[PDB]
Amino acid sequence: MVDFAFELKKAQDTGKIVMGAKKSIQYAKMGGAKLIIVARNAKPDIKEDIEYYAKLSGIPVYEFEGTSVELGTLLGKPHTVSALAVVDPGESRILAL
C-alpha cells in the first residue's frame, strides 16, 4: 500500500513540488512536471484544464480523494490547495500514484 500523506511529505521534503491550481495548469501546459495531483473538490473546470493540457504534454494526473483544505493542510499551508505539481519526487515513490 502507498500512504499518500507519507509520500507527499517525503516528496515535499526531498524533492520539489509546486503548489496551486494556476501553477499546476501552467506546468501542465509546459510538460515541466512528473505528476499532477488534484483535490477531489477542485473546481471541475480547473480539473478539466489540467487533464486536457497534461494529456497533451504527457503528464500523469492523480486525484487525491480528499478535499483541498486537507491537501493544503498536508502541505503545511493555512489555506486550501486544490492542485499541485510534482516536479521532482525526491526520494518518494509518489509517482506510483
Residue numbers in the entry: 0 to 96
Anything the authors wrote about it?
Protein stability can be rationally improved by optimizing various types of interactions. One strategy is to optimize charge-charge interactions on the protein surface. The electrostatic contribution of an ionizable group to the Gibbs free energy of unfolding can be estimated from the differences between the pKa values in the folded and unfolded states of a protein. charge at 298 K and 333 K were similar, suggesting that the electrostatic contribution of the charged residues to the protein stability is insensitive to temperature changes.
Structural analysis revealed that Arg-8, Arg-21, Arg-42, Arg-54, and Arg-76 are involved in crystal contacts. To reduce the crystallizability of the L30e protein, we created a quintuple variant, 5R→K, by substituting these five arginine residues with lysine. We chose these lysine substitutions because they conserve the surface charges of the L30e protein and because lysines are less likely to form crystal contacts than arginines. Guanidine-induced and thermal denaturation experiments showed that the 5R→K variant has essentially the same Gibbs free energy of unfolding (ΔGu) and melting temperature (Tm) as the wild-type protein. Most importantly, the 5R→K variant was very soluble (>2.6 mM) under the NMR conditions (10 mM sodium citrate/phosphate buffer), and thus we used the 5R→K variant as a pseudo-wild-type, i.e. L30e*, in subsequent NMR experiments. The titration curves for E50 and E62 clearly display biphasic transitions. E50 and E62 are in close proximity in the crystal structure, and thus these observations suggest that the ionization of E50 and E62 may be coupled. To determine the pKa values of E50 and E62, we used the method of global fitting of titration events (GloFTE) developed by Nielsen and co-workers, which allows an estimate of the titration profiles for individual titratable residues.
